[PDB]
Design a protein around this ligand. Structure first.
Ligand SMILES: O=c1ccn([C@@H]2O[C@H](COP(=O)(O)OP(=O)(O)O[C@H]3O[C@H](CO)[C@@H](O)[C@H](O)[C@H]3O)[C@@H](O)[C@H]2O)c(=O)[nH]1
Ligand SMILES: [Mg+2]
Lengths: 289, 286
């Protein structure tokens, strides 16, 4: 049912300095393809027709990536680079792309709130994809849509992480449903020590939010910032159904250079253009300092 | 010695499409640091005072990378990110940076030619660094400068590559000098089969070019830099090569780029041990 997916992209990417002084984090390549394209594609495959990218005035450049490049397409076609030509055609052809300008990076809730002018009356629910999380294979938003179909309200996403490894995450307080991968959300605890974690279900950056989230974001106490978790807790307090889908597949974390490199190596090893030679090189390389 | 280094950065990097549709190839990070900073640092360490980046109009944002970012700096200082603050201050403090515009990508020789208006009377010799080649450790240009001081003329750089591995490269035709790592260049053969390779010396992307190169570039038939060098040798200009014995990386395609990033990350304690452990498991399965 959702048609509009929101991608919050207004943070600098401090962890990727000095590169992110000049390059938007969301345009950095995983092998050859930027994360913004990877999340755009995932959104489209889940039925999004429209993408609202929230960013700063300085990173408006992310928009151009979704514009055609006619001269480049011609030059590739003339060199017989049909595979490269298909690669560059992919992102502009995925969906309709708009930008919402968040003047100052006041956090995720504020970013989602800044997308509301880009919504129309048909947007009763919106998908939100954080571009630092890659959730593999495609399809978590379709699982979350089934939960919305059944229960109404809003739907979150979790990874299943042992309590001794979960303390970097927000962690859901949950109850069971009839589906082992679907829980009712009662609340969330930020970065609990292992022995205080309410579950093994760590908050992942995929959301299906009912339009009620925007009214909730206007009614929560602003910070020093609008905390999306506070708006979700307000909905829960007011009886809005909130459930979570537990992702069982793989995932990558592009929020720091180390997790980014893991993603790129994992993908390159599966690509015949690179994999065999990379694997042979790695085998030798890891045996020395 | 030379004071001006030229970095030809006007080609797209078609092996990194679709990313390089929007992002200059030379700003792609090796772990966390763009290649253009790595080659600027190398140039500075060899005594460059000035960097002339040849780029297209869509890639002029390479320039802004070398400008101070006061508000970002102020913000990092207020957050006590001393290390990230140092990292952002590094590139702007290395040297004076100018941009020359190559309207179209007519090749390397043409990229070099387009830097000539940025040169002055002191520029008798210019360094050229190709930003897809990392030559490690720093110092090849200083070795090349010693050769220029002894012999005059121009100086090239070679990797010592076995004949059965050398066919992807241009391969110098050479004669000995009194230094094992310095050869006189008689010519170059493009991509020879192993049995036709005139040496084990493959051309690397580092150059110390006498100002005579510009006149050669004006007189070669349409431009390959190697043709302008060949014209110089024909006209009696001394050309030598220094053989690099050390390490190198190739950022020309994603595979070589990942080798560089993994190599550097394994040596950095922020990433190294966990990445090593992850790689150990990962390479044991498809
Ligand atoms: O019109 C152009 C074309 C290329 N370049 C730049 O020139 C550099 C080198 O171009 P590339 O296509 O990567 O050259 P190669 O095919 O790798 O070959 C060159 O670089 C090798 C070292 O890497 C040498 O062995 C070769 O003799 C030399 O021609 C790159 O940064 C390009 O951006 C420009 O600035 N403008
Ligand atoms: Mg090259």
């Amino acid at each position: 049912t959702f048609t509009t997916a929101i991608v919050p992209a207004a943070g600098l990417g401090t962890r990727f300095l000095p590169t992110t002084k000049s390059v938007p984090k969301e345009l950095l390549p995983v092998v050859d393809t930027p994360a913004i394209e990877l999340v755009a594609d995932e959104a489209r495959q889940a039925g999004a027709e429209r993408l609202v990218i929230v960013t700063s005035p300085a990173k408006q450049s992310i928009a151009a990536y979704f514009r055609p490049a006619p001269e480049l397409e011609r030059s590739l076609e003339e060199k017989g680079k049909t595979g490269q030509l298909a690669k560059i055609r992919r992102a502009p052809e995925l969906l309709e792309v708009e930008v919402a300008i968040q003047e100052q990076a006041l956090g995720l809730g504020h970013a989602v709130a800044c997308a509301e002018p880009n919504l129309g009356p048909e947007d009763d629910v919106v998908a939100v994809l954080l571009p630092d999380d890659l959730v593999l294979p495609h399809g978590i938003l379709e699982r979350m849509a089934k939960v919305r179909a059944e229960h109404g309200g809003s739907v979150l996403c979790a990874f299943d992480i042992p309590k001794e490894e979960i303390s970097a995450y927000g962690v859901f307080d949950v109850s069971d449903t009839d589906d082992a991968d679907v829980k009712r959300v009662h609340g969330m605890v930020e970065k609990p020590p292992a022995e205080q974690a309410p579950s093994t279900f760590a908050a992942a950056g995929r959301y299906l939010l009912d339009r009620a989230i925007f009214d909730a974001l206007r009614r929560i106490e602003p910070g020093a910032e609008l905390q999306l978790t506070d708006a979700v807790a307000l909905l829960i307090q007011e009886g809005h159904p909130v459930h979570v889908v537990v992702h069982r597949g793989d995932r990558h974390d592009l929020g720091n250079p180390g997790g980014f490199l893991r993603a790129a190596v994992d993908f390159a090893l599966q690509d015949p253009d690179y994999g065999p030679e990379l694997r042979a090189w790695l085998t030798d390389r890891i045996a020395r300092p």
